[PDB]
Amino acid sequence: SSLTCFSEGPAWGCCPASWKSFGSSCYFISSEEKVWSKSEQNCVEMGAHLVVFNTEAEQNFIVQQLNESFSYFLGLSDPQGNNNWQWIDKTPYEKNVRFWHLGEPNHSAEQCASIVFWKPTGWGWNDVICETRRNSICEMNKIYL
Amino acid sequence: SSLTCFSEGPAWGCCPASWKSFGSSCYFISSEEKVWSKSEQNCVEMGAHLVVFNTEAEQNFIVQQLNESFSYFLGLSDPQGNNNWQWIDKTPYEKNVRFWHLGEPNHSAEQCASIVFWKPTGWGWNDVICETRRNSICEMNKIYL
Ligand SMILES: CO[C@H]1O[C@H](CO)[C@@H](O)[C@H](O)[C@@H]1O
Ligand SMILES: CO[C@H]1O[C@H](CO)[C@@H](O)[C@H](O)[C@@H]1O
Ligand SMILES: [Ca+2]
Ligand SMILES: [Ca+2]
Ligand SMILES: [Ca+2]
Ligand SMILES: [Ca+2]
Ligand code: NA
Ligand code: NA
């Protein structure tokens, strides 16, 4: 039963103490490995969703919290395998950022999006099979007090 | 700048991140050495006063944050040297606890009070010269949000 709260120039914005804060959102990085649907379930049970990246500044902050030997499920999927990628919170895909790696996405049967570290580019999105187990990242709104 | 907040079952009660929480107060243990007048001013510059002990449970909590080799100023003083001890917040001295060590207080000229660790009793209060330099303990109301 613990928040941490930072000053605002509302006078406080807050996140649970074991999460991470940036912008108008809290984040949680899960080091357990699950399929995509159960990764979404774990976030929901904390009152959040798989992460949605809305600007480059946001991603830049998330990647410094991650371990480079692991890949991380995002909230971006294509459930009919016809490259109609959707964000888990319905914000439009085409008008927003799309930080895919070089030569990705590239398979119709790889219907989930993950962020992963490849040299020489570093972090970027790769599409993968939704039924293989990986880490995840959640995001929810800040609490304002 | 940060606060830490605990559920209250007014829904949150908080304290600044580097302080300590118990009951309806936040506490700070200053490990610099000042005279009694400057120990008080230092607390005031943080929006606090030197500590007032109101029950024994409160004191049991504080001395577990303290270093047994050091003595600490209290918000309790006798300005005219006639044993009319008063609390810094004007709470009545008689209808309240009085954890003086055995054989204390004992000098009209020792007009400030401090908490100190004496074998065998352990922790308890002792009257001392205000113009000696010691550690101190600040207390302030909880911020509620
Ligand atoms: C080595 O990486 C390649 O193999 C994985 C299979 O998991 C693909 O998803 C990825 O896009 C690449 O083509
Ligand atoms: C170590 O304690 C003794 O000496 C201090 C002097 O500060 C007195 O206040 C106290 O009563 C004791 O006699
Ligand atoms: Ca976002
Ligand atoms: Ca792929
Ligand atoms: Ca008190
Ligand atoms: Ca004394
Ligand atoms: Na795909
Ligand atoms: Na005295």
Residue numbers in the entry:
A (entry chain B), B (entry chain A): 62 to 70, 74 to 209
Sentences from the paper on this structure:
In an attempt to stabilize the conformation of the neck domain, the dectin-2 extracellular fragment beginning with residue His44 was fused to the same 3-heptad dimerization domain used with BDCA-2. This fusion product elutes in gel-filtration at the molecular weight of 44 kDa expected for a dimer. Analysis of new crystals formed by the dectin-2 dimer fused to the dimerization domain provided further insight into the interface structure. The geometry of the CRDs in crystals, which contain two dectin-2 polypeptides in the asymmetric unit, is almost identical to that observed for the isolated CRD. Two additional amino acids, SerSer at the N-terminus of each subunit, are visible in the new crystal structure. The extended interface in the new crystal expands the 4-stranded antiparallel β sheet across the dimer interface observed for the BDCA-2 and dectin-2 CRDs, contributing to a more extensive surface area of 453 Å2. The extended N-terminus introduces two more hydrogen bonds in the β-strands connecting the monomers, between Ser62 and Ser68. Additional reciprocal packing interactions can be found between Trp76 of one monomer to Leu209 and Leu64 of the other and between the Leu209 residues. Since the dimerization domain is likely to form a coiled-coil, the fact it is absent from the crystal indicates that its position is not ordered in the crystal, which in turn suggests that the neck region of dectin-2 may be flexible. The two additional serine residues visible in the new dectin-2 dimer crystals described here project to the side, indicating that the neck could bend around the CRD-CRD interface to link to the transmembrane domain.
